[PDB]
From a paper:
The [name] domain has a key role in mediating both negative and positive regulation of JAK kinase activity and numerous disease mutations locate in [name], including the prevalent hyperactivating [name] V617F in MPN. To gain insights on the compound binding modes to [name] [name] and to analyze whether any differences could be observed between binding to WT and V617F, we determined the crystal structures of selected small molecules with [name] [name] WT and V617F.
Phenylpyrazolo-pyrimidone compounds 34, 35, and 36, analogs of hit 13, engaged [name] [name] domain with selectivity over JH1. Diaminotriazole analog 18, diaminotriazine compounds 4 and 24, and phenylpyrazolo-pyrimidone analogs 34 and 36 targeted [name] [name] with selectivity over JH1, although the affinity of these compounds to [name] domain was micromolar and thus lower compared to the JH1-targeting compounds 1 and 2. All compounds bind to the hinge via three hydrogen bonds (H-bonds) with the exception of 36, which makes only one hydrogen bond to the backbone amide nitrogen of Val629. Phenylpyrazolo-pyrimidone compounds identified in the present study are a novel finding for [name]-selective binders of [name]. The affinity of phenylpyrazolo-pyrimidone compounds as well as of other [name]-selective small molecules to [name] [name] was rather low, in the micromolar range.
Author numbering: 536 to 808
The structure:
């Protein structure tokens, strides 16, 4: 599928952070757009670490999956650039960046109706993926991007998009999956081949907890061994102090995967608030 983009049409600018075996940059893509018009377009650039180029297949598959669907709550993929040892994904630049950092910076002016709207949008995206039997596999607030802020004065809601999952937990080292507790569900800790649609219901619950906790990271105080034992003892997350969504979080984070609710049922629960 992927449009091949020339290295010379890509400029790398500021470093924005990192993902698993990747570095993330803002950049600019020079392109011919619709009517033959030349454009300099802001792009989000993800670079697979040279030392991990043996994961390149899973790195690109994560984006290819998303790019074969179109949906207003999914980030657009523009193409790839493979410059010898560099494996580069080129994607839409989303103005206000990651939800997790946005929640922390603005936690004092984000109320329950803003959280509810964002949860509803995320659920709409996940229902779309579920209807298409497409597993995401890394739903978390870091991977949700805010394209538009709420505008009180015009009643405009915030608007979010979900980015691609990155390299799959089916191929990642077990130590990384343990650090990713409690977004990674207990059955995938047992066996990463247990990755299924029910995975995304668990992770959606962890992500709602983030949205409700002002950007805190659940269980961050626990090292990997205690995270593993958290699953062994079958604990649940503490209610967010803003507890309106606590019941939904706990229903999604069901240790029995087959009992986790459909995204249709999840949306019905959200709309009754
Ligand atoms: O489009 C954007 C825009 C963006 C951004 C960052 C800082 C200020 C304004 C926007 N930050 C990101 C990330 C990102 C995620 C985790 C750590 C660092 C950056 C992603 C990604 F695709 F990687 F999810 N897209 N994105």
């Amino acid at each position: 599928v992927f449009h091949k983009i020339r290295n010379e049409d890509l400029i790398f600018n500021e470093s924005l952070g990192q993902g698993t075996f990747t570095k993330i940059f803002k950049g600019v893509r020079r392109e011919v757009g619709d009517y033959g018009q030349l454009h300099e377009t802001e792009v989000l650039l993800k670079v697979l670490d040279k030392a991990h180029r043996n994961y390149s297949e899973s790195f690109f598959e994560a984006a290819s999956m998303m790019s074969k669907l179109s949906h207003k709550h999914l980030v657009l993929n523009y193409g790839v650039c493979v410059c010898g040892d560099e494996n580069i994904l080129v994607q839409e630049f989303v103005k206000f960046g990651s939800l997790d950092t946005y929640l922390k910076k603005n936690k004092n002016c984000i109320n329950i109706l803003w959280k509810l709207e964002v949860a509803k949008q995320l659920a709409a995206a996940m229902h779309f993926l579920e209807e298409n039997t497409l597993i995401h596999g890394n739903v978390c607030a870091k991977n949700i991007l805010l394209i538009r802020e709420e505008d009180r004065k015009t009643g405009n809601p915030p608007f979010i998009k979900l980015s691609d999952p990155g390299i799959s937990i089916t191929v990642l080292p077990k130590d990384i999956l343990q650090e990713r507790i409690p977004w990674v569900p207990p059955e995938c800790i047992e066996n990463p081949k247990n990755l299924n649609l029910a995975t995304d219901k668990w992770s959606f619950g962890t992500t709602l907890w983030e949205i409700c906790s002002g950007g805190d990271k659940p269980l961050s105080a626990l090292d990997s061994e205690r995270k593993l034992q958290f699953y062994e003892d079958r604990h649940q997350l503490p209610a967010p102090k803003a507890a309106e969504l606590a019941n939904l979080i706990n229903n999604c984070m069901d240790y029995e995967p087959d009992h986790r609710p459909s995204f249709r049922a999840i949306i019905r629960d959200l709309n009754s608030l």
